[PDB]
């Protein structure tokens, strides 16, 4: 079982403070983008569904990074899915 929820993160000039894995055409085929590390609300294993207005379904890891780079500085609304 899994919950979808909405959280707010701060976009700083470097990024959002986490690394993603998975995505389209990743290791085990097409998988969701999930957080695998917080560089120090979100936690490891969270699946990213939407970053601001951009849906993450079907994106590669690199495409997702370009989505993060384009985000204006300040608060950013993000939709995630989290297990149990």
């Amino acid at each position, epitope marked *: 079982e899994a919950t979808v929820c909405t959280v707010t993160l701060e976009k700083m000039s470097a990024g959002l403070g986490f*690394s993603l894995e998975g995505g389209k055409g990743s*290791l085990h085929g097409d998988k969701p983008l999930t957080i695998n590390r917080i560089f*120090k609300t979100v936690q490891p294993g969270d699946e990213i569904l939407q970053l601001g207005g951009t849906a993450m379904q079907g994106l590669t890891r*690199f495409e997702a990074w370009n989505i993060i780079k384009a985000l204006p500085d300040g608060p950013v609304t993000i939709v995630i899915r989290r297990k149990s």
Partner: antibody
Framework: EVQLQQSGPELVKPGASMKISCKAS????????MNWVKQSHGKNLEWIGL????????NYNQKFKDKATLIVDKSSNTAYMELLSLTSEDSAVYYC??????????????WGQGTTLTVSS | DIVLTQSPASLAVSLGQRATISCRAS??????????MHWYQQKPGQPPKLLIY???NLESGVPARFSGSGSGTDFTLNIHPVEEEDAATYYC?????????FGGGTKLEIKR
């Protein structure tokens, strides 16, 4: 899980060129940047450059701009570094190492086993 | 280019004691809430192994006796309590800006 397997040691004549390969397994090759590092007995550890296999975009250390060329092959999950007009100064152990460009963090969390190059006649 | 200077060049430390290694950068490697400074361990015949990333974070699988701290231009790697297998050369590396560079290394001898 993650493995970076480099090609074998090589003896090469001055003025020639040579290619070192780094075959990646256990992760998404086109998801992470590949770095190359030189370890010698003169300057010890030096960063040469990196390449993003997704689009072959690269950044070089300027000291190596005329010495090294980076390419990738997506179909074989392999990164290559070509070293040009070799001198004995190029004799060293070379490493490939994975980094993450997310938040521009670029630490080198996985390394190849190293490739020993000797330039000599 | 940023120059990293490690101190000391070598040190010896008894089992169970504390090893302290410092790295000094020629200019700041902190920005946007990060310190782009990382630590590696290297034993002969092997590539460097990542110990600490972004100044103070423990790489997964690295024993808790390793820690790092600092910001700006001054960083320190600490090992406590030191064990036999920590005999190695330790390196710092920045990723603040191009080109990435490494310190000169510090060799750690275990006394017995």
């Amino acid at each position: 899980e993650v493995q970076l397997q480099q090609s074998g040691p090589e003896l090469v004549k001055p003025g020639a060129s040579m290619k070192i390969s780094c075959k990646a397994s256990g992760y998404s090759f086109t998801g992470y940047t590949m770095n190359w590092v030189k370890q010698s007995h003169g300057k010890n550890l030096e960063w040469i450059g990196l390449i993003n296999p997704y689009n072959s975009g690269t950044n070089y250390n300027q000291k190596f701009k005329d010495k090294a060329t980076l390419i990738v092959d997506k179909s074989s999950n392999t990164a290559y570094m070509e070293l040009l007009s070799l001198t004995s100064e190029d004799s060293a152990v070379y490493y490939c190492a994975r980094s993450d460009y997310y938040d521009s963090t670029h630490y080198f969390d996985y390394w190849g086993q190293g490739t020993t190059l000797t330039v000599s006649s | 280019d940023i120059v990293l200077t490690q101190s000391p060049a070598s040190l010896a430390v008894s089992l169970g004691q504390r090893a302290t290694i410092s790295c000094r950068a020629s200019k700041s490697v902190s920005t946007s809430g990060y310190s782009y400074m990382h630590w590696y361990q290297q034993k002969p015949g092997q590539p460097p192994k990542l110990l600490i990333y972004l100044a103070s974070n423990l790489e997964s699988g690295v024993p808790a006796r390793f820690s790092g701290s600092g910001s700006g231009t001054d960083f320190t790697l600490n090992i406590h309590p030191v064990e036999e297998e920590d005999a190695a050369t330790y390196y710092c590396q920045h990723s603040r800006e191009l080109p990435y560079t490494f310190g000169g290394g510090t060799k750690l001898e275990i006394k017995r």
